Symmetry: none
Subunit: 203 residues, 6 copies
């Protein structure tokens, strides 16, 4: 069982936790809670991995995707120590470490300004779990592989600017991140999302 992804979030920002509070089909997150995202292979082995992590401590399970190529899942708990413990118990159980993860890589990233009404409606109707985007409101879009690392980009984005979380897809082969706001805030938050990706790209 190899480690394809591994991303720890010190503290879920307000809008970040609120978003994953919507999508999560299990235990719900809260602002301040630590989070642990992990993809592995085979994907069916994520059931065994879910058992171990929950057996290790008081961590809770929020998400659990199970494909054949790989399986993802997220853990929540206010205390960073509790979540990090279960995380290191899973790796020490599958002969793996944090750096054995697959290095992230950006494939697309841009800032479209003054979005039109029509564009905003399709952004708001097609599988959106974030907030509403308005016309005249810029937007930052990002794609990454492995997909999990998009969460790291979203947490630093809000932590470093006043923008609006519109959507955060972290499940699958690739990921997606949509933000919005005045061009100033969106460009300062966009450069912060990519900077967060460059940190993992240097391990």
């Amino acid at each position: 069982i190899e480690l394809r992804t591994y991303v720890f979030l010190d503290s879920l920002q307000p809008q970040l936790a609120a978003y994953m509070g919507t999508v999560s089909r299990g235990f719900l997150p809260i602002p301040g809670d630590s989070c642990l995202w992990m993809e592995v292979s085979p994907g069916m082995a994520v059931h065994r991995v879910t058992d171990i992590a929950l057996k290790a401590s008081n961590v809770r399970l929020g998400q659990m995707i199970v494909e054949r190529a790989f399986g993802s899942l997220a853990l929540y708990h206010k205390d960073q120590s509790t979540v990090l413990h279960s995380g290191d118990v899973v790796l020490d159980a599958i002969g793996s470490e944090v750096r054995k993860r697959t290095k992230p890589s950006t494939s697309w990233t841009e800032v479209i300004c003054a979005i039109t009404p029509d564009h905003a409606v399709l952004i708001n109707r097609q599988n959106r779990s974030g907030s509403m985007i308005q016309s005249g409101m810029s937007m930052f879009i990002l794609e990454t592989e492995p997909a999990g690392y998009v969460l790291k980009a979203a947490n630093e984005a809000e932590k470093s600017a006043n923008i609006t979380i519109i959507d955060v897809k972290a499940v699958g082969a690739f990921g997606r991140l949509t933000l919005a706001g005045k061009e100033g805030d969106v460009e300062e938050a966009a450069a912060a999302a990519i900077r967060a990706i460059d940190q993992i790209s240097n391990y």
Copy 2:
């Protein structure tokens, strides 16, 4: 016949605010509105008697059918257009046909209104997983709620409240037994949006 067609709601909006415009475009089944467009909501009973009210409003104007839906018992629609005179003209014709006027409407009966300060984390994430088509709500954030009946009247309070303060539209359900309007933001910011919503319903009685 055309006399048994009750007129639950009849609200007009001179100009759709940004948030309420993008929200309507998200939850509507008709043609999406463009921010600043005039609107004309209308609810009636029997539920599917809105088919004649729609046919008349469209035949008699250049307005687009922004919304049409037949609730369990009732049925509502919404007409959009940039020209105010165009929207209102549609309403004039439909009123002449069914034999009615503006003041023959079911006046807004506010069934609930309050403001909860510092919404707990649990309370917040719960509202987010509530078939939410608007924006998210956050913990520590103050919230304002306004239930009414008919449901189509909270559309007016949602608009004039947004004009008054830069709040966050969580959900504006104007179709159903009751119309529920939920906002959010900072305590002071929400107390201003709330007052604006009170007069919206109170200036119709």
Copy 3:
């Protein structure tokens, strides 16, 4: 007990027409009907008292449970079978058990009926995005609508109207507070299907 079991609807169809057969198979949760099959719709209250009515109809016949569902307040079912005598036999047994007969049913109260000629383009596409399980409607096309109560009675008008003219079944919702029946086609073709639907409900009073 078995006496408090109201009998909202009790309609029988000698033979399911093509369009109404494929439509029922699309929206039903039971075994799909084959065109030409006999049907027996039954609505009751309390909502989930239909469990005993179903158990009896199946135990006492070779009929298949084509539909069973418990609406918010009410609950309906549908029995299918090629043999007419088989379907009717099920109904005979269930009536003996609950202590009732054919004429102890809630007679159809038509709450709305009309025909709109040349449906505008906006009005048409709107009806298409209305949780539509039937066929599409087109602009310029004429439409006929028939709301009633109980809802299970528009199933009879939908069938006999289809027999009368080659129209287009948009939606036949027989479950709910009200039963809504929507057709379409050419003006003259729809005026014939409409008349047939009027007598379907009027020959039950």
Copy 4:
């Protein structure tokens, strides 16, 4: 104001049984319960007046908001916690705020109750395709049903019935006009779970 807030349901469960615990976690929109956790269901009207009842229960205790939802007309919630005293403490505070007590609740009016032995194959598979969030039902299997009002009271009968016998929870819908509770198992096993459910509702009158 706080006086117009009707108290439809007010049930407490000392300990959530296995099946009813995993089921609640499946259909709830809040924080999932852990088997053995105390619960406190509460329904009110107007529908979205549950926002103040929730805010108070959470502010005044360490309980998690297991559920919150605004039905068409009503609105319910559920508080979970391992400590019984913690859950009950939340209820004490909310009662003091709205000006009410335990015995000012809308007593359970059982609208339907029965037991169907040897459920036919058609009847079974039909219940399975009924927006089912619980376990499956099988043919030949005996079933027990219990509809009531308010709907939030079948949560008590579902728990004490599960304690009495090792049955199968099909569906426990506590939100809506009516509360429907469906079980299953062997004839004798179900007749014991049924009796336990009768006293659950009858010891509240």
Copy 5:
């Protein structure tokens, strides 16, 4: 940004516009309106492409699919000129033309007659946005790559016969088209759908 698909429809036939009026998660079509379908790569670049097209003229946005392999979208407007202008502004913005599109190709096509009741129900229940098919009613099925060109086949089909639009999948790597009616109308409409595909296959 390469052009994978490009298909302009002179005038949406009655049943065609009615179908895309249902599926579209944005602005709705109308009989007579012109339509412009376009797939490109990367798929995330379709957001930038949506911005440009809507900025070019009074065209409206009806659909917008966004994958990683490629991104699709549809534009509507009564006037053919308005839609064609925005279309040529997008290509001149991404260094591309109409003929640089990927040539269509059929992988499957047949006419099954006298469909059975059971078959019709699964056709009507499994993700159908068209009209109902009846038993005793023939059926034409078609598959194409790129997927977008299936719209060109559907528009000519109804324009050349009296059949029934049952479904039209144009999003993804491949497309699908289901028709129905008396064998005569379905075979005359089927040969017209394939003929429309052969026109693009000769560019």
Copy 6:
């Protein structure tokens, strides 16, 4: 048209038929009925295959998946003869036989015991059409290719033990099977599911 999968079930066990009674978007199964699952290629050819099978006898159609890689479908009828006849009429129509099917192969299989509450909720909420799993309840998970053969494993599992059917995914490139119960019943049913797979692996 090649045969990718072929699996005949003598008699749908109680919980098996009850499960496929939920998922099937067509005619519904019943305990005792025989079932016939078949995947082929191209997937669009499954429409032609559906027509033939239903034309051959009184068999009914319950499922019909139609991809491009391959198309699946299931047939139901109390009498084993009726279902087997239509099955052999389809193969004799596409120049194929039972043994020309693709041999099954296991990629994953384990028994996790004493599942935790959090794990059970995500198992119960994420696309489950079976029954509820409880905490303290073991679980058997299996994956197979071709996907169709998972049904053969589920039928023998219940037929050979007292467990709980939680989910049975048989559509797609691969399949999945989730069971639960006391470790004793789950391990005796797990060894029976794999044994059923080994029978087809020896043809």
